[PDB]
Amino acid sequence: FRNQYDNDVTVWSPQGRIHQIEYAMEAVKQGSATVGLKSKTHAVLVALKRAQSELAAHQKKILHVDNHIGISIAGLTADARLLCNFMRQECLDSRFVFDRPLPVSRLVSLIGSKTQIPTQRYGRRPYGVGLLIAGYDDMGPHIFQTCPSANYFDCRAMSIGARSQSARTYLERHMSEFMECNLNELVKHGLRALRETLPAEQDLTTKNVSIGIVGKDLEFTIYDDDDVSPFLEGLEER
Amino acid sequence: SYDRAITVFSPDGHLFQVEYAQEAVKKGSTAVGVRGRDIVVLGVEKKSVAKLQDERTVRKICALDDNVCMAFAGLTADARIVINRARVECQSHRLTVEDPVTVEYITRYIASLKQRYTQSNGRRPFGISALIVGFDFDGTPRLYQTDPSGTYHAWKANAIGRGAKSVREFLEKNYTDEAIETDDLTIKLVIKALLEVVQSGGKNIELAVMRRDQSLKILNPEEIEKYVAEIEKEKEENE
Amino acid sequence: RYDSRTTIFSPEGRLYQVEYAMEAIGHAGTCLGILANDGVLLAAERRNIHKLLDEVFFSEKIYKLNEDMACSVAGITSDANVLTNELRLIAQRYLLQYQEPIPCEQLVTALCDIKQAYTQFGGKRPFGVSLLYIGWDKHYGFQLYQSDPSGNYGGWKATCIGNNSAAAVSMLKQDYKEGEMTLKSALALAIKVLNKTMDVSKLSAEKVEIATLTRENGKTVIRVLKQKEVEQLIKKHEEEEAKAE
Amino acid sequence: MFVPCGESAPDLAGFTLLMPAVSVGNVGQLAMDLIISTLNMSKIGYFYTDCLVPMVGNNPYATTEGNSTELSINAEVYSLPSRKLVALQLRSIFIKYKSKPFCEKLLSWVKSSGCARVIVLSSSHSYQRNDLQLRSTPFRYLLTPSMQKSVQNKIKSLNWEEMEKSRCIPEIDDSEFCIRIPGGGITKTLYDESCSKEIQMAVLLKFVSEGDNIPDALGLVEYLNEWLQILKPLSDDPTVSASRWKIPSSWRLLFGSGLPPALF
Amino acid sequence: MSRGSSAGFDRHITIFSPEGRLYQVEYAFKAINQGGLTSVAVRGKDCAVIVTQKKVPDKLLDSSTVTHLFKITENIGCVMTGMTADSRSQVQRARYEAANWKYKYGYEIPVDMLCKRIADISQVYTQNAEMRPLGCCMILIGIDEEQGPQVYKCDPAGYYCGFKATAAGVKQTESTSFLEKKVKKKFDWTFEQTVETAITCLSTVLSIDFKPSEIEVGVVTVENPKFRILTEAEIDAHLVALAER
Amino acid sequence: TGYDLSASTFSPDGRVFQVEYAMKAVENSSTAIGIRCKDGVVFGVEKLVLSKLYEEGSNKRLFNVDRHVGMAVAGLLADARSLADIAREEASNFRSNFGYNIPLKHLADRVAMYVHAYTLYSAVRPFGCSFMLGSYSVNDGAQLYMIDPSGVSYGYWGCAIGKARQAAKTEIEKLQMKEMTCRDIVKEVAKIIYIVHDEVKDKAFELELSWVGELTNGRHEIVPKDIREEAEKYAKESL
Amino acid sequence: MAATFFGEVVKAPCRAGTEDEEETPEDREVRLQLARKREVRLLRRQTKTSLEVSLLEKYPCSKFIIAIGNNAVAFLSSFVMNSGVWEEVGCAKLWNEWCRTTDTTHLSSTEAFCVFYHLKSNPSVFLCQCSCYVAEDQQYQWLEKVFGSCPRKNMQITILTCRHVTDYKTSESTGSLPSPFLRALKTQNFKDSACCPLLEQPNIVHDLPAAVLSYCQVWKIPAILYLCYTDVMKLDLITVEAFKPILSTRSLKGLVKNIPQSTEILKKLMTTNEIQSNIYT
Amino acid sequence: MFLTRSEYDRGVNTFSPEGRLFQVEYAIEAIKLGSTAIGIQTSEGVCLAVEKRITSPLMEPSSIEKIVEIDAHIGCAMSGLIADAKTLIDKARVETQNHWFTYNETMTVESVTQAVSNLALQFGEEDADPGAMSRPFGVALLFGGVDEKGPQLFHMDPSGTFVQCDARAIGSASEGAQSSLQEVYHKSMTLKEAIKSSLIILKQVMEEKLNATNIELATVQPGQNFHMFTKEELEEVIKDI
């Protein structure tokens, strides 16, 4: 019973703790699964699509931001749209002022700076959205994970959403065999990781997967339904 | 719920300020209107007699413009503020979009203001509902009735305030084409309607009509006592 | 269900805060005005029991507003000071804008609008004051208006505010006449009123405010009655109940 | 419906009965838990009712493996004829529209049983304190007239502070001084009902700060201690009571589960 | 709009008690003694001297960076008591304050005026709803033009006064008692039988003889008016003089 | 306890409880160490590896904050980032206007003033983090300042913050840092880190180190990999 | 309840849940009408009568396996209802914050108000199916509608419910547990052996299954609760298979027959499951 | 753990336990008081029908404009709190015109719904007067349109989320309508076939019986602009039951 203390973002508990932030932490894993692996040369984004509203076309998780950066969402749609709108605005400002893509490691820092703003002040809430951002620049392929903790994590393969931990275990096991993969095999590995989150009774369909890719020469293209057939096909079962 | 964010959704969603102000108009003095073939009557009682009053100041019936009048019920001062703001907007429209405004447009403006007293923790909801009535640009009769929620429905004829329901289901039980053919019978229906609710006779019921394209004419305590003239119509021909 | 901060309704739609405000009015000094055929006269009660008080100058509850009107007050006195300053300000600004004295109805309306607005967005306490207005305009002759913290208001040929006010008007309305209410008779009957509604203490010249509104020679004249005529009237009163037996 | 755990006879003809007052902090409940922990009252029966919101635990007073598997609900009754004590433990909270009839039924059952003393543990909102109680100690006591007239010597000795019951029609200067416990839960209702039934009963309350109430609970159990002496005279320099009052095993982590290793 | 004050007498500063006593001010006053330090301020006809402990319960610390004597102007200095952070801030505040004074009036701010302005700043905190009073007391020394040295001490309450000799901190009551005893009888205080007496005060009230590492002393002299701080190269010699008697 | 719901509150005995909560917040995080040596300043922070998945270098806590000062944090990461990039305009606002390089004392006294500003307002909560400030220059030698959420600034000969604070400092004071050069310092720093490091509850950590001083000529920079590796070898063989 | 304007009084609620202000004649008049409103009607569907006598007295029972929670009811329906033939003697007429909107409907196919079922071969086995949230007083109302105050000693109860892993409190972080997982609680008289480890001492259960368990334990009735702590309350396959160890207990040995046909029934049901919003919640 | 104090929704934008905001799901099924509305999106066009649940005969039915068009090729269906629903509508209209003159074409339906969603979500700036509600909208919206998609349908919930849904029903009987519709829906549907099936399900769901006045429907097809059906059209449609 410390529920005097888990009620406003701006109130500390007598544990050196903020409970609203960790509630926002728990909020995102009620979203949808995702995968954020990487290669020497490619960054792809595997996502599971809300195949619960049947006979109604579903949502979109992988959102194009800039030709060299794309993102994914797993938390509050509202925060997701606001943050992606800010993403587009900042990328356009960068390409305007500098006539060059914005390197990711700075954009993500700005993300963190912005989302920290409500963390400290009364009358606001943390941006309860989980973000996987994928991008490529002169430094090379990158995957950055973002949490409503206003703190981001630079990983090379991440999963946020329901049952993500199984995918995380699978990715930590297969860590080594991502460094050298052509596009299709990298996407296949991410697909297998996502599939493991699904129950064995389920299969990744073209109707519920939203692969998106950026590359050294392939600008961030989002692969929606049946267009993902070539990647999905040829996939061995569990 | 309690004080803060004065307009909070209810656990089921029953926005408490809305129906709380809704209840404000059941202690509001009963008003009513009828949209006739070529005349519109706007009747309202004043069962707070205080016969040592100036009736001029305590009318319920205010006129919005050359082509619009209204009545209300509830917190009087709030209604006065509404009336002044609506008059200002009507003047602005007649300046900018110069034309006599239609009843629907001013009603929609009223509803927009009324419902925009729902944001902005700040401002509290208004405790009035109105009976906007007037003749259009074309001369057709019109009628519009709103509620603190923000809805701005239109009626053949409606009543608001204290015991408004009983008046309503008297009204459809008697509202018919062979009740509006004559202006005298048109007003007589309103007379009887409040007779059902009045303090036992033609006591302090203030009303006025607006025939087409002339003005708001105050139905006055004439030598015949216009009020009790129609009143005695019902007294000695309701048998 | 719960009451606070002057902007929330109870499950009956009437504002608790303003209804509380109309309770100090029930505790404020009794104040009443009478509308005569050819004048207006106004009475009120001093809570000035202390003999160490002084400087009774020109009023103690009768605040004068424009060239031709004055008001009377009951409630939180400093609230009243703010209200009266504001009233004078808009009265003079109306004159500036129009080069005409403010009609009484317009001024009362413009004030009660602000009073109501404080029963609206915000949260700060409303004015705990009920106001009486006596004045004249070319449109309507002598007029008398009551004000309410709710913003409600009305014209009265006779009204009272303060303690015992309900009883006072209860006797008045069984006593007031339709239009043979001359200034001196109205004074005498107002003094009878105040005598009867006044508390147990015997009535004194040193507790009444009597100020009148009159016309001569195209000018509107407001006086605060001096003492001497006050004992004149009150001793007249005690002897015409020397009739009453 | 007071049902014993085994359809037995608790024969509570003269055992002092203890119950806590559901109030801010649940300081009464916490203090009662500490009392049962330190004196190890055994569970004899249940006080069944359709009044409180139902919770289930598994013997929060668990000490060994054997007693850990004992199912526990919000309403149990612990008694100890070793020092003539019986205790009523309440875990959950009060359903709306039900507290007062519950108190009436409780006193009816007490009359059917007839305990010795009906001492109550309560607490009050610390922000609703006048300056007279703000200057002084947070210890307060109320005793029913039936039993105060006899024991008053001990309280007179121990230097407590009598709560000043306030006007319950306050604005009238001649209205009666009258019971008023802010944030008292069912405490005032219990006191008024008890004096109406002329039942020997005691009310002890403290003004409580917020958050953890371990200092509050220990203060309250000590405040019960000096009058009841249901435990050895503490002899304020503790040397034991600093580590004598053994905390119930259930009082593990309360504020949460743990630090989520994702933000620090 | 804002989170607001917690409902309670002691919960927040703005609410008055039934006797209108500000609780949070008392809470600040007995929040001053956090840190254990107690300071003493005494002044003679030539000098004003302020002395306090230098608690260094860690030798990972640097003695230089830890201090409580903060020069405000080259002529005017001060001492701090209370929590460290608010003392930080008010030192900043007063430095800015006096600089603005000199800029806007062309001459060095008098000690009393600086104290008054700081007291005003502290007071305005006790007016608002999300201000928290700066729980620290700050003491001044300086030579104005003719009045020689002055000693001034504001407080979280905003009360200040000029002191012939004063002190603040934990053992403040005992310091004040010894100060009264000394001031009543021996009162020349040139420079050595001077404030060195206050060092005797601080030692006697606090502990055994001090050796200077624990002591921090700053002075201003009428004939040499710089705010300047003595060291263990200096304070040691003083205190060996004091030890012998 | 109790009156601990706003920063702008005072305890019954005069404490600001929601600064002590931040004091225990910095307790939650992991240890960070910085030692001032004969002619430079050396930092060192061990980072908990939450998962092998994360790329090395993420969650860095060794922030370059200008050319000549360095910064290491502990406590809440996001607010640490916030104070970090605050300290990179206070520098600009001192160099863009005053040209030369920021002295450490002034930079601390303002950033400490900033965090104290946060620790005194109800509308905000204190930054639940503490951090270090180290630098070196020929005109000013080497300095080290520690800042806690309370807003207090202190210069340290050697200091640490985190959940092994006590153990860290108790291992620190056993060294003659005032007369030792950086090469002898780095090995000692790693030694302290590994000695105080807890694994049985916090296995899977990582070592990170950086300094600034004479060896890099007043330029803050991360420890070169080879020195890091040989110091790690020393720490392991120091068992 | 503050911040209507600047600089105001917060008034935090109370920690015993005491913000009920510690009863005028019109108040208990409206209390009478309100109590008669919120009626838990043991409605004999299509007849709605002849059920005044409670089940333990209306029809002697031997097994009362009850599911509370959308996933619990899905689990029991799919793994038992397909096995045998289960007709409904009746259900419970329940209005509250949940299952609102004119409870009399098409039977609320994608909702639930405690629909009971009994078998053909041995009709002594009852299955109550509902995730409906009954009011704090209404648990007692329903329980004495079905059971009454006469606790018989021939019937045994299995209870299923789910609560979020966020609620579970253990020394380690919740987001580090192998969710979903299982916990159970036994009555004092429930001498029957369990299949999953008991709940840890601090963490408790405060709800309708707590009501049922309290009733059974207090009145000596042997009963058992079964509890899975999952991360999502939506209709989830995984949390369905989380309860799979129940398929070995003594009370269930004679019911479950076919697993894969159950699994295909589940895929049918959650392919046609609710239209649960795309907010990600 | 013991239940104690807790401020629940004192602040707007307070995350619930298990991370699920209050006002948003308070309004989600404050919607369920709203009238049932049906929308079918087939290749031939879309149809938007809704009950008006005439409370009393004393209203003439013409007043309740439950259905409006955002533009000539964007019709809108709404259910729930009409009050701020009209402000939503007005923003949609002004945004459509803004796109139209700034960009000389017809603003596509998807962008319209996306901008409308943008309009929501601005709850808490209680200190900031400009741009406020401090209240989520309590109305669900249905958009029909024709563009280089042609027929389209978008459902909005009071949470700033939407989908390229087709055959999506909202209202008090929303779940029953959706369930029946699922089994009723056909992938290739002719225009009055959607009209017919939707009208049958409406007749099946609502409380009052069905006539011309009881409901209304509107359609847009690639042929031409928004059409709002008149009475005699409703009789000549409901002739066949």
Give, in order, the Cα–Cα distances in Å from D258 to each of A16, A17, D255, F162, G133: 12, 10, 9, 17, 29
Number of helices (H), then strands (E), in chain E: 6, 10
For chain H positions 50-109, those within 8 Å of chain G (CB to CB) are none
Q: Indicate the burial class of A132 (C-beta count within 10 angstroms; 0-12, 13-18, 19 or more).
A: buried
E residues 1-30 lying closer than 8 A (beta carbon) to H: 1-2
Cα–Cα distances in angstroms (integers) from residue G264 to residues A53, A205, G78, G269, in the given order:
19, 18, 10, 9
Q: What is the CATH number of the domain that holds A88?
A: 3.60.20.10
Chain H: give the shortest CA distance to residue A40, in Å: 36
Residue pair E190/E219 in contact (Cβ under 8 Å)? The answer is no
Cβ proximity of F198 and F205 under 8 Å? no
Provide the 8-state DSSP code for F201.
Answer: T
* Helix, strand or coil, per DSSP, at residue D152: helix
- Centre a 10 Å sphere on the Cβ of residue B92 and count the other Cβ atoms it contains: 12
Contact criterion met (CB < 8 Å) for A112 and F81: yes
Q: Is F136 exposed, middle or buried (0-12, 13-18, 19+ CB in 10 A)?
A: buried
Rounded to the nearest angstrom, the gap between the alpha carbon of residue G217 and the centroid of all alpha carbons in its chain is 17
Q: What's the number of domains chain A is made of? A: 1
What is the dihedral sign for C-alpha A82, A84, A89, A90?
A: positive
Kindly list the distances between the CA atom of residue A221 and the CA atoms of A101, A109, D16, E191, in Å, as whole numbers in the listed order. 16, 24, 78, 85
Query: Tokens for C36?
Result: 């005569």
- What is residue E66's DSSP assignment? -
Cβ neighbours of A99 (radius 10 Å): 7
In chain H, residues with a C-beta closer than 8 Å to the C-beta of G111 are: 175
Can you tell me the distance from the alpha carbon of A137 to that of A100, in angstroms, rounded to the nearest whole number?
Answer: 10
Pick from F5, F8, F12: CB nearest E132: F8
Determine the residue type at A214.
Answer: V
Q: How far apart are CA E83 and CA A234, in angstroms?
A: 69
Host domain of residue B93: 1-239
With beta carbons less than 8 A apart as the criterion, state whether A208 and A48 touch: yes
Nearest-Cα residue of chain C relative to residue B54:
C155
- Asked whether G157 and G186 are in contact (CB, 8 A), the reply is no
Superfamily of domain E2-245: Aminohydrolase, N-terminal nucleophile (Ntn) domain (3.60.20.10)
What is the rounded CA–CA span in Å between residue E48 and residue E65? 24
Name C70's Cβ contacts closer than 8 Å, sequence gap at least 6: C42, C62, C63, C64, C134, C135, C211, C213, C222
Residue C153 is part of a domain; what is its CATH number?
3.60.20.10
Interfacial D residues in 109-168 facing G (CB < 8 Å):
125
* Cβ atoms E189, E45 nearer than 8 A: yes
**8 Å CB contact of F2 and D126:** yes
> All domains of chain H, ordered by start, with CATH?
9-241 (3.60.20.10)
- Alpha-carbon distance of A61 to A74, in angstroms, equals 8
**In this complex, which chains have at least 3 CB pairs below 8 Å with chain E?**
A, D, F, G, H
Please tell me which residue of chain D has the smallest CA distance to A14. Answer: D211
**Domain at B223, CATH number:** 3.60.20.10
Smallest Cβ distance to D134: which of E6, E7, E9?
Answer: E9
- Residues in B touching C112 (Cβ below 8 Å): 77, 80
CA distance E165 to E70: 20
All domains in chain F, ordered by first residue: 1-238 (3.60.20.10)
Please report the sign of the dihedral spanned by the C-alpha atoms of residue E230, residue E231, residue E236, residue E239.
positive
Is A27's CB within 8 Å of H185's CB?
no
Enumerate the residues of chain E whose CB falls inside 8 A of the CB of residue F11: 27, 31
Enumerate residues 6+ apart whose C-beta is below 8 A from B17: B6, B7, B118, B124, B125, C8, C9
Sequence-distant (6+) residues with CB within 8 A of B216 are B63, B69, B208, B210
Tell me the one-letter amino acid at D173. Answer: D
DSSP result, A189-217: HHHHHHHHHS-TT----TTSB--EEEESS
Question: Helix B226-237 and helix B183-195: axis angle, to 10°?
Answer: 80
CA nearest E243: which of E220, E218, E211? E211
Pairing of the two strands D85-90 and D16-20: parallel
Q: Tell me E126's DSSP state.
A: T
End-to-end CA distance of chain A: 44
- List the single residue in G with minimal CA-CA distance to E1: G3
Element (H, E) at E140: strand E136-143
- Count other C-beta atoms under 10 Å from residue D99's C-beta: 20
Measured CA distances, B136 to B88, B90, B133 (Å): 19, 14, 10
Between A and H, how many CB-CB pairs are < 8 A?
95
**Chain-centroid distance, C-alpha F87:** 13
Cβ atoms of A125 and H13 within 8 Å: the answer is: yes
E78, F112 contact by CB (below 8 A): no
* CB E190, CB E167: distance < 8 Å: no
- Partner residue facing G198 (CB), from D69, D252, D256: D69
CB contact under 8 A, D263 and A21: yes
Closest by CA position to D22, among listed D175, D205, D178, D258: D205
Domain limits for position C206? 1-245
Most distant pair of Cα atoms in chain D: their distance:
64
List the alpha helices (DSSP H) in G78-170: 138-146
Number of separate domains in chain B? 1
End-to-end CA distance of chain B: give it in Å, rounded. Answer: 53
Helix H or strand E segment including B179: helix B177-180
Q: Residue G175 and residue A77: Cβ atoms within 8 Å? A: no
Task: Calculate the dihedral angle through the C-alpha atoms of C233, C234, C236, C240, rounding to the nearest 10 degrees.
Answer: 130
